[PDB]
Symmetry: none
């Protein structure tokens, strides 16, 4: 309800940033990859690859789907 609406708003604004802020995605992926170090040697670099892979598909499914559908995917809507 409010959670579905809040999810839809967040997705909407992320789509807007991705489409109008050429620095947004890179800065976000780079920041998350840095947090991956928290996992320590071995696991950290896997986490980094994971983030690299997830961002590609997230930007892809988000550049192709509507926010409500993206939110339903993770159980925040419907």
């Amino acid at each position: 309800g409010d959670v579905c609406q809040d999810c839809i708003q967040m997705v909407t604004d992320i789509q807007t940033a991705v489409r109008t802020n050429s620095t947004f995605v890179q800065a976000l992926v780079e920041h998350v990859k840095e947090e991956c170090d928290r996992l320590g040697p071995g696991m950290a670099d896997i986490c980094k690859n994971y983030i690299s892979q997830y961002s590609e598909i997230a930007i892809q499914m988000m550049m192709h789907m509507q926010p409500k559908e993206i939110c339903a995917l993770v159980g925040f809507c419907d």
Copy 2:
């Protein structure tokens, strides 16, 4: 509505923490989604990832339930 990603994240995390207290199964779909994208790592790693997430998801959920939404959003990169 054209909003702010950082504020959206703070509100969103605030709602999730509220929904989890009401019903601890609320983030199930999200966890399954994270585990499923493990396949993007290709053969081999996909298995290391799925097992890792499967091992610490409960602990991760517990940690985040004790963290402040802004702290969580700062961690993930939507705020600051």
